[PDB]
Amino acid sequence: ARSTNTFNYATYHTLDEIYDFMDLLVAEHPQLVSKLQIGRSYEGRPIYVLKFSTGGSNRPAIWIDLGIHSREWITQATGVWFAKKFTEDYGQDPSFTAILDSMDIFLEIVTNPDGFAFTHSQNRLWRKTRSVTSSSLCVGVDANRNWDAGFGKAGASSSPCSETYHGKYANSEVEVKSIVDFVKDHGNFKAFLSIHSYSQLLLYPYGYTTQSIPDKTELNQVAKSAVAALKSLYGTSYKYGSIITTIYQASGGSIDWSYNQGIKYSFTFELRDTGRYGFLLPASQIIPTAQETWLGVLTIMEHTV
């Protein structure tokens, strides 16, 4: 509210509160955090990214996006906790301190602002963007099927009314193109993590093809380690593997795109739970979910540094 120290991390927040939170955090830690606007959503809402850095010029970076699918509230709530966590652990935790002393972390808490606002306003289970097409009465695109990676192939729908509609063409959604341009312009990202829910899974490329990535052995071992670390707090069990062998074929996914850009450490997290509550995860599970997930993310970060 008035300070990130009085902000209630154990409850779900609206878009305005999360945006106010960003300004508070930047005001409290000006030498570490800065807020960047990488674009504007379809409905004109600013798209913000928090940059955590201790200095340098274009240092190797880590990308983390959450809430690309709006109804997955546990992701945006985890993102807020993450932001605060970075500021409290720098200079306290030896490992995280070493990471921030050599690398920058870019965090996008609300990747799909329009959808998020909608879930609070009209439909709690809305997942797509809110772009309109004259071609249909239906609204929105599945932003995680809109990337240029096997775009339009099996694992996505060509129907505008579908929950998995991929869009008219790759990167048609400004919420996606804003990330694409930013990452390509930066040119020095080493890891790309996209957070979702639910299912308790840690996945790596690919989803659109059965082809195995040349870094499978390494990513599979990193995934195994991250899962072990995450489980150490509350015993939460995760499964890991490539997207297509673990779930099913899925085209136009973000990490398939990032990996094809040369970002080796591309992973997607599917948080709690396994179905008991699903997308409506109780607010009482926010902090413990965030705490365990942190352990997994840091593990991946340690391997990138």
GROMACS .gro file of C-alpha atoms in nm:
model
  305
    1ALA     CA    1   0.000   0.000   0.000
    2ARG     CA    2   0.227   0.280   0.124
    3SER     CA    3   0.539   0.067   0.120
    4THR     CA    4   0.628  -0.270  -0.029
    5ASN     CA    5   0.667  -0.369   0.335
    6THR     CA    6   0.297  -0.314   0.401
    7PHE     CA    7   0.186  -0.469   0.071
    8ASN     CA    8  -0.022  -0.784   0.130
    9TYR     CA    9   0.162  -1.060  -0.057
   10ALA     CA   10  -0.083  -1.324   0.068
   11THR     CA   11  -0.378  -1.211  -0.142
   12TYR     CA   12  -0.464  -1.150  -0.508
   13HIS     CA   13  -0.442  -0.797  -0.643
   14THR     CA   14  -0.590  -0.592  -0.928
   15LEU     CA   15  -0.391  -0.437  -1.213
   16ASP     CA   16  -0.377  -0.090  -1.055
   17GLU     CA   17  -0.242  -0.225  -0.725
   18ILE     CA   18   0.029  -0.425  -0.903
   19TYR     CA   19   0.128  -0.120  -1.109
   20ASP     CA   20   0.139   0.099  -0.797
   21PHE     CA   21   0.354  -0.171  -0.635
   22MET     CA   22   0.610  -0.131  -0.914
   23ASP     CA   23   0.651   0.242  -0.853
   24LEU     CA   24   0.688   0.186  -0.477
   25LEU     CA   25   0.960  -0.076  -0.528
   26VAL     CA   26   1.153   0.146  -0.770
   27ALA     CA   27   1.125   0.441  -0.532
   28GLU     CA   28   1.259   0.226  -0.244
   29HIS     CA   29   1.548   0.073  -0.438
   30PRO     CA   30   1.649   0.324  -0.709
   31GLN     CA   31   2.003   0.185  -0.738
   32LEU     CA   32   1.877  -0.165  -0.812
   33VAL     CA   33   1.536  -0.153  -0.979
   34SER     CA   34   1.406   0.051  -1.271
   35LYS     CA   35   1.072   0.034  -1.453
   36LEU     CA   36   1.071   0.013  -1.832
   37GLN     CA   37   0.774   0.040  -2.068
   38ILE     CA   38   0.827  -0.193  -2.363
   39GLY     CA   39   0.497  -0.118  -2.534
   40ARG     CA   40   0.122  -0.079  -2.497
   41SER     CA   41  -0.152  -0.341  -2.493
   42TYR     CA   42  -0.432  -0.361  -2.748
   43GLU     CA   43  -0.654  -0.154  -2.519
   44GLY     CA   44  -0.377   0.100  -2.462
   45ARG     CA   45  -0.252  -0.018  -2.121
   46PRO     CA   46   0.120   0.025  -2.058
   47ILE     CA   47   0.328  -0.294  -2.066
   48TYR     CA   48   0.592  -0.277  -1.793
   49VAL     CA   49   0.911  -0.471  -1.725
   50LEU     CA   50   1.119  -0.438  -1.406
   51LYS     CA   51   1.496  -0.438  -1.459
   52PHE     CA   52   1.715  -0.548  -1.168
   53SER     CA   53   2.078  -0.449  -1.216
   54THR     CA   54   2.386  -0.355  -1.012
   55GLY     CA   55   2.544  -0.179  -1.308
   56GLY     CA   56   2.737  -0.243  -1.625
   57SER     CA   57   2.648  -0.210  -1.990
   58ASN     CA   58   2.427  -0.471  -2.158
   59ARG     CA   59   2.525  -0.748  -1.911
   60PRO     CA   60   2.412  -1.108  -1.978
   61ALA     CA   61   2.044  -1.114  -1.886
   62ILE     CA   62   1.769  -1.339  -1.760
   63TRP     CA   63   1.414  -1.296  -1.885
   64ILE     CA   64   1.114  -1.395  -1.675
   65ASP     CA   65   0.754  -1.337  -1.782
   66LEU     CA   66   0.439  -1.422  -1.592
   67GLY     CA   67   0.067  -1.407  -1.656
   68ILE     CA   68   0.072  -1.444  -2.035
   69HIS     CA   69  -0.252  -1.635  -1.972
   70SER     CA   70  -0.459  -1.396  -1.760
   71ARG     CA   71  -0.668  -1.641  -1.552
   72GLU     CA   72  -0.351  -1.795  -1.408
   73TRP     CA   73  -0.353  -1.557  -1.108
   74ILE     CA   74  -0.096  -1.752  -0.906
   75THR     CA   75   0.162  -1.641  -1.166
   76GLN     CA   76   0.112  -1.262  -1.131
   77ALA     CA   77   0.101  -1.298  -0.751
   78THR     CA   78   0.426  -1.499  -0.763
   79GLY     CA   79   0.578  -1.227  -0.981
   80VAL     CA   80   0.510  -0.960  -0.722
   81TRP     CA   81   0.668  -1.175  -0.452
   82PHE     CA   82   0.970  -1.237  -0.679
   83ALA     CA   83   1.022  -0.862  -0.730
   84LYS     CA   84   1.029  -0.798  -0.356
   85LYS     CA   85   1.245  -1.106  -0.299
   86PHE     CA   86   1.523  -0.981  -0.529
   87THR     CA   87   1.556  -0.659  -0.329
   88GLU     CA   88   1.566  -0.840   0.007
   89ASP     CA   89   1.812  -1.111  -0.095
   90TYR     CA   90   2.075  -0.904  -0.273
   91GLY     CA   91   2.359  -0.872  -0.023
   92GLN     CA   92   2.206  -1.136   0.205
   93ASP     CA   93   2.210  -1.453  -0.001
   94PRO     CA   94   2.561  -1.532  -0.134
   95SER     CA   95   2.437  -1.710  -0.444
   96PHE     CA   96   2.175  -1.458  -0.553
   97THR     CA   97   2.418  -1.174  -0.478
   98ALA     CA   98   2.677  -1.328  -0.712
   99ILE     CA   99   2.415  -1.361  -0.982
  100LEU     CA  100   2.305  -0.995  -0.962
  101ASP     CA  101   2.667  -0.875  -0.946
  102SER     CA  102   2.724  -1.019  -1.296
  103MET     CA  103   2.381  -1.040  -1.461
  104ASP     CA  104   2.064  -0.838  -1.508
  105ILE     CA  105   1.716  -0.980  -1.448
  106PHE     CA  106   1.416  -0.858  -1.647
  107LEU     CA  107   1.080  -0.938  -1.490
  108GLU     CA  108   0.741  -0.894  -1.660
  109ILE     CA  109   0.472  -0.950  -1.395
  110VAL     CA  110   0.165  -0.885  -1.613
  111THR     CA  111   0.239  -0.994  -1.968
  112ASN     CA  112  -0.129  -0.968  -2.073
  113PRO     CA  113  -0.275  -0.654  -1.902
  114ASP     CA  114  -0.602  -0.651  -2.097
  115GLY     CA  115  -0.685  -1.012  -2.018
  116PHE     CA  116  -0.593  -0.958  -1.653
  117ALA     CA  117  -0.823  -0.657  -1.620
  118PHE     CA  118  -1.098  -0.862  -1.783
  119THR     CA  119  -1.064  -1.151  -1.535
  120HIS     CA  120  -1.127  -0.901  -1.256
  121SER     CA  121  -1.402  -0.723  -1.443
  122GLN     CA  122  -1.609  -0.972  -1.644
  123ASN     CA  123  -1.479  -1.331  -1.671
  124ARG     CA  124  -1.244  -1.480  -1.408
  125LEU     CA  125  -1.144  -1.759  -1.647
  126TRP     CA  126  -1.053  -1.550  -1.953
  127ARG     CA  127  -0.707  -1.647  -2.083
  128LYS     CA  128  -0.659  -1.478  -2.423
  129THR     CA  129  -0.572  -1.120  -2.521
  130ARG     CA  130  -0.857  -0.880  -2.602
  131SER     CA  131  -0.773  -0.798  -2.963
  132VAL     CA  132  -1.080  -0.781  -3.188
  133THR     CA  133  -1.105  -0.902  -3.549
  134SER     CA  134  -1.382  -0.787  -3.786
  135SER     CA  135  -1.373  -1.142  -3.921
  136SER     CA  136  -1.542  -1.270  -3.606
  137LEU     CA  137  -1.768  -1.183  -3.312
  138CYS     CA  138  -1.515  -1.362  -3.094
  139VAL     CA  139  -1.238  -1.174  -2.915
  140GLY     CA  140  -0.876  -1.252  -2.835
  141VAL     CA  141  -0.576  -1.464  -2.921
  142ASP     CA  142  -0.392  -1.726  -2.717
  143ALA     CA  143  -0.072  -1.525  -2.675
  144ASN     CA  144   0.137  -1.840  -2.614
  145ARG     CA  145   0.048  -1.977  -2.957
  146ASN     CA  146   0.121  -1.649  -3.138
  147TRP     CA  147   0.502  -1.677  -3.149
  148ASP     CA  148   0.711  -1.750  -3.457
  149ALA     CA  149   0.799  -2.113  -3.377
  150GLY     CA  150   0.607  -2.370  -3.578
  151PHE     CA  151   0.342  -2.100  -3.602
  152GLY     CA  152   0.013  -2.230  -3.735
  153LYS     CA  153   0.114  -2.597  -3.708
  154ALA     CA  154  -0.065  -2.870  -3.517
  155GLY     CA  155  -0.121  -2.779  -3.153
  156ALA     CA  156  -0.311  -2.455  -3.213
  157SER     CA  157  -0.653  -2.356  -3.349
  158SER     CA  158  -0.722  -2.141  -3.656
  159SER     CA  159  -1.069  -2.057  -3.521
  160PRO     CA  160  -1.097  -1.704  -3.365
  161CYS     CA  161  -1.353  -1.837  -3.116
  162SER     CA  162  -1.117  -2.107  -2.992
  163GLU     CA  163  -0.950  -2.083  -2.651
  164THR     CA  164  -0.629  -2.173  -2.835
  165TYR     CA  165  -0.668  -1.944  -3.139
  166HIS     CA  166  -0.318  -1.861  -3.266
  167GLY     CA  167  -0.399  -1.533  -3.441
  168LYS     CA  168  -0.389  -1.409  -3.801
  169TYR     CA  169  -0.007  -1.428  -3.823
  170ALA     CA  170   0.301  -1.480  -3.605
  171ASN     CA  171   0.354  -1.193  -3.360
  172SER     CA  172   0.022  -1.035  -3.454
  173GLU     CA  173  -0.043  -0.951  -3.087
  174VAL     CA  174   0.132  -0.635  -2.965
  175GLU     CA  175   0.178  -0.795  -2.622
  176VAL     CA  176   0.395  -1.060  -2.792
  177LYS     CA  177   0.569  -0.840  -3.049
  178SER     CA  178   0.671  -0.600  -2.769
  179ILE     CA  179   0.867  -0.882  -2.607
  180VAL     CA  180   1.012  -1.007  -2.937
  181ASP     CA  181   1.147  -0.663  -3.033
  182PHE     CA  182   1.283  -0.597  -2.686
  183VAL     CA  183   1.468  -0.928  -2.662
  184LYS     CA  184   1.608  -0.913  -3.017
  185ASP     CA  185   1.724  -0.554  -2.963
  186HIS     CA  186   1.892  -0.648  -2.633
  187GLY     CA  187   2.074  -0.941  -2.795
  188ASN     CA  188   2.239  -1.070  -2.478
  189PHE     CA  189   1.976  -1.283  -2.301
  190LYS     CA  190   2.102  -1.613  -2.163
  191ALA     CA  191   1.785  -1.751  -2.008
  192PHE     CA  192   1.414  -1.716  -2.089
  193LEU     CA  193   1.160  -1.838  -1.834
  194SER     CA  194   0.784  -1.822  -1.882
  195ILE     CA  195   0.557  -1.889  -1.582
  196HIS     CA  196   0.212  -2.053  -1.607
  197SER     CA  197  -0.032  -2.264  -1.404
  198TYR     CA  198  -0.143  -2.519  -1.327
  199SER     CA  199   0.002  -2.874  -1.341
  200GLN     CA  200   0.332  -2.871  -1.150
  201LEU     CA  201   0.567  -2.919  -1.444
  202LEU     CA  202   0.903  -2.786  -1.561
  203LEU     CA  203   0.931  -2.804  -1.941
  204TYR     CA  204   1.191  -2.729  -2.209
  205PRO     CA  205   1.174  -2.718  -2.596
  206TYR     CA  206   1.019  -2.822  -2.817
  207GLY     CA  207   0.642  -2.823  -2.827
  208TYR     CA  208   0.578  -2.781  -3.200
  209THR     CA  209   0.812  -3.058  -3.317
  210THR     CA  210   0.922  -3.408  -3.214
  211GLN     CA  211   1.279  -3.309  -3.295
  212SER     CA  212   1.502  -3.318  -2.986
  213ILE     CA  213   1.705  -3.010  -2.898
  214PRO     CA  214   2.086  -3.050  -2.915
  215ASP     CA  215   2.111  -2.934  -2.551
  216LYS     CA  216   1.865  -3.193  -2.416
  217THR     CA  217   2.111  -3.365  -2.182
  218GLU     CA  218   2.208  -3.039  -2.013
  219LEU     CA  219   1.859  -2.888  -1.990
  220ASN     CA  220   1.720  -3.219  -1.870
  221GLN     CA  221   1.978  -3.230  -1.589
  222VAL     CA  222   1.915  -2.867  -1.497
  223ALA     CA  223   1.542  -2.939  -1.495
  224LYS     CA  224   1.599  -3.238  -1.267
  225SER     CA  225   1.800  -3.021  -1.026
  226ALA     CA  226   1.545  -2.738  -1.024
  227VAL     CA  227   1.266  -2.982  -0.943
  228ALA     CA  228   1.469  -3.132  -0.658
  229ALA     CA  229   1.536  -2.786  -0.512
  230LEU     CA  230   1.171  -2.680  -0.545
  231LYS     CA  231   1.047  -2.997  -0.373
  232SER     CA  232   1.276  -2.938  -0.073
  233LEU     CA  233   1.046  -2.685   0.097
  234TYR     CA  234   0.700  -2.836   0.109
  235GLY     CA  235   0.738  -3.164  -0.078
  236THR     CA  236   0.566  -3.038  -0.394
  237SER     CA  237   0.625  -3.286  -0.676
  238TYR     CA  238   0.696  -3.171  -1.029
  239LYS     CA  239   0.745  -3.363  -1.352
  240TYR     CA  240   0.984  -3.244  -1.623
  241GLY     CA  241   1.063  -3.309  -1.988
  242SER     CA  242   1.019  -3.156  -2.333
  243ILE     CA  243   0.682  -2.994  -2.403
  244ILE     CA  244   0.567  -3.242  -2.667
  245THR     CA  245   0.666  -3.561  -2.481
  246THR     CA  246   0.532  -3.440  -2.146
  247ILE     CA  247   0.203  -3.285  -2.252
  248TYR     CA  248   0.115  -3.278  -2.619
  249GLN     CA  249   0.210  -3.101  -2.936
  250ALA     CA  250   0.168  -2.723  -2.907
  251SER     CA  251   0.269  -2.467  -3.170
  252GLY     CA  252   0.379  -2.105  -3.149
  253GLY     CA  253   0.507  -2.127  -2.791
  254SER     CA  254   0.734  -1.866  -2.636
  255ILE     CA  255   1.025  -2.085  -2.520
  256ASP     CA  256   1.038  -2.269  -2.854
  257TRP     CA  257   1.087  -1.925  -3.007
  258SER     CA  258   1.345  -1.809  -2.754
  259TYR     CA  259   1.544  -2.131  -2.784
  260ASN     CA  260   1.550  -2.087  -3.162
  261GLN     CA  261   1.689  -1.737  -3.100
  262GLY     CA  262   1.990  -1.893  -2.932
  263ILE     CA  263   1.872  -1.858  -2.572
  264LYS     CA  264   1.983  -2.197  -2.443
  265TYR     CA  265   1.818  -2.189  -2.101
  266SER     CA  266   1.453  -2.169  -2.209
  267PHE     CA  267   1.210  -2.324  -1.960
  268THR     CA  268   0.838  -2.301  -1.885
  269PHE     CA  269   0.698  -2.350  -1.534
  270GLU     CA  270   0.344  -2.475  -1.468
  271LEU     CA  271   0.279  -2.398  -1.100
  272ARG     CA  272   0.035  -2.542  -0.840
  273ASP     CA  273  -0.179  -2.728  -0.817
  274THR     CA  274  -0.266  -3.053  -0.996
  275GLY     CA  275  -0.638  -2.988  -1.025
  276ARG     CA  276  -0.790  -2.966  -0.677
  277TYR     CA  277  -0.843  -2.591  -0.725
  278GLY     CA  278  -0.671  -2.542  -1.059
  279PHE     CA  279  -0.684  -2.181  -1.173
  280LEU     CA  280  -0.865  -2.077  -0.854
  281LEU     CA  281  -0.576  -2.156  -0.622
  282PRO     CA  282  -0.653  -2.032  -0.266
  283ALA     CA  283  -0.478  -1.710  -0.160
  284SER     CA  284  -0.330  -1.900   0.135
  285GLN     CA  285  -0.113  -2.091  -0.113
  286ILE     CA  286   0.046  -1.783  -0.270
  287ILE     CA  287   0.350  -1.742  -0.047
  288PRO     CA  288   0.440  -2.111  -0.019
  289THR     CA  289   0.403  -2.145  -0.398
  290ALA     CA  290   0.625  -1.842  -0.454
  291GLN     CA  291   0.883  -1.962  -0.202
  292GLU     CA  292   0.929  -2.306  -0.358
  293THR     CA  293   0.924  -2.172  -0.715
  294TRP     CA  294   1.200  -1.929  -0.622
  295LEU     CA  295   1.425  -2.223  -0.530
  296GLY     CA  296   1.371  -2.375  -0.874
  297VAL     CA  297   1.427  -2.050  -1.061
  298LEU     CA  298   1.745  -1.969  -0.869
  299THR     CA  299   1.877  -2.317  -0.949
  300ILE     CA  300   1.837  -2.245  -1.319
  301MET     CA  301   1.998  -1.903  -1.271
  302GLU     CA  302   2.301  -2.055  -1.097
  303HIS     CA  303   2.356  -2.274  -1.404
  304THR     CA  304   2.334  -1.978  -1.641
  305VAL     CA  305   2.591  -1.766  -1.454
   0.00000   0.00000   0.00000
